[PDB]
């Protein structure tokens, strides 16, 4: 029960790591990476537009 569970967890973790390292070559992480910064600058530029309107002319 404990040794067998350890073996199962180790094999599954190794397989998951291999699949992760094979799918990282495609670059699926880049799409998630590029999505975060595109959202960080979004509100950082929209608030600039918003408050500059209130400083009025």
């Amino acid at each position: 029960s404990f040794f067998v569970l350890n073996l199962v967890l180790g094999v599954l973790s190794g397989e998951f790591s291999k699949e992760r390292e094979k799918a990282k070559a495609r670059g699926d992480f880049q799409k998630l990476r590029e999505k975060q910064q595109l959202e960080e600058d979004l509100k950082g530029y929209l608030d600039w537009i918003t408050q500059a309107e209130d400083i009025d002319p």
Binding site: L38, G44, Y45, L46, W48, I49, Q51, A52, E53
Partner: protein, 324 residues
């Protein structure tokens, strides 16, 4: 010969009694000439080897060969600067170091055709352009804000309005912000002896827009006599290509927005009415991005108003102490 010793301290004494002597004019230099190689200076010592595109602001008129000015480095001191005629005169002397400086080659042909250097090999020729080594610049270098999109596009309008807001508050009593409408690109260094002196010429230039492209220079020079930074919002300056060699030579700030996809998002924030020049901004940003920075002396890379204000204020404050 004790005469040289007497005149050695004469220049220093006059230049030290008054520490609050105002600056008269300013001049840019672009010649990498080592002033220490030649020991020709009124005061014995080693001069400053000024680099190209260095802003020298004159404040004295000593003689016709050398003058007195100041540089643009923090805690600046008093040094010597050669006259453009003196610099032009010594420019020809540099080529005299070589065996020949003209048509007659020394390819093992000596004593047959001496070919003394004519006026062609001297500085008399090359009068088609005759660019002086020294260029006249205002005492205070202006500032031009370019980007991140079309000037006056309701998105750039809100962009620099906040930037102009904090600038006129933090620098209160120290800044002068004005808006202009006339053209600025149609202005070169020298196109005629008397360009547009009279408005009753009735020619191809009488009805054109030349009495505003030039008249904004010396008018703003008087405003620059206070040595205060000047920023405008004209709808003409969209690339520093024409501002790199103009008389103004102002301060350009890079205000890029990083990704080009975000630009569409702020465009769609207001929805429609952005189709007038929407395709332009698809390339207008990229116009000042694919080109090398070079022109932008300082670059603003911040996605928020708060730290963007501190970036501009950081550069202005340090540059403020350079010419003082």
């Amino acid at each position: 010969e004790s005469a040289r010793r007497e005149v050695e301290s004469q220049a220093q004494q006059q230049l030290e009694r008054a520490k609050h002597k105002p600056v008269a004019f300013a001049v840019r230099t672009n010649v990498s000439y080592c002033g220490v190689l030649d020991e020709e200076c009124p005061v014995q010592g080693s001069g400053v080897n000024f680099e190209a595109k260095d802003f020298l602001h004159i404040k004295e008129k000593y003689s016709n060969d050398w003058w007195i000015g100041r540089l643009v480095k923090e805690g600046g001191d008093i040094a010597f600067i050669p006259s453009p005629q003196r610099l032009e005169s010594i420019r020809l002397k540099q080529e005299q170091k070589a065996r020949r400086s003209g048509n007659p080659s020394s390819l093992s042909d000596i004593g047959n055709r001496r070919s003394p250097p004519p006026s062609l090999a001297k500085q008399k020729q090359k009068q088609a352009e005759h660019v002086p080594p020294y260029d006249v610049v205002p005492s205070m270098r202006p500032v031009v804000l370019v980007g991140p999109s079309l000037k006056g596009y309701e998105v750039t309008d809100m962009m620099q309005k906040a930037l102009f807001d904090f600038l006129k508050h933090r620098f209160d009593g120290r800044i002068s912000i004005t808006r202009v409408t006339a053209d600025l690109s149609l202005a070169k260094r020298s196109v005629l002896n008397n360009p547009g002196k009279r408005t009753i010429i009735e020619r191809s230039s009488a009805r054109s827009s030349i009495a505003e492209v030039q008249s904004e220079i010396e008018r703003i020079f008087e405003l620059a006599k206070s040595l205060q930074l000047v920023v405008l919002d004209a709808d003409t300056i969209n690339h520093p290509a024409q501002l790199a060699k103009t008389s103004l030579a102002p301060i350009i700030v890079f205000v890029k927005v990083s990704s080009p996809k975000v630009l569409q998002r702020l465009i769609r924030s207001r929805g429609k009415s952005q189709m007038k020049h929407l395709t332009v901004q698809m390339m207008a940003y990229d116009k000042l991005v694919q080109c090398p920075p070079e022109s932008f002396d300082v670059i603003l890379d911040e996605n928020q108003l708060e730290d963007a204000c501190e970036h501009l204020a950081e550069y202005l404050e340090v540059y403020w102490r350079a010419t003082h």
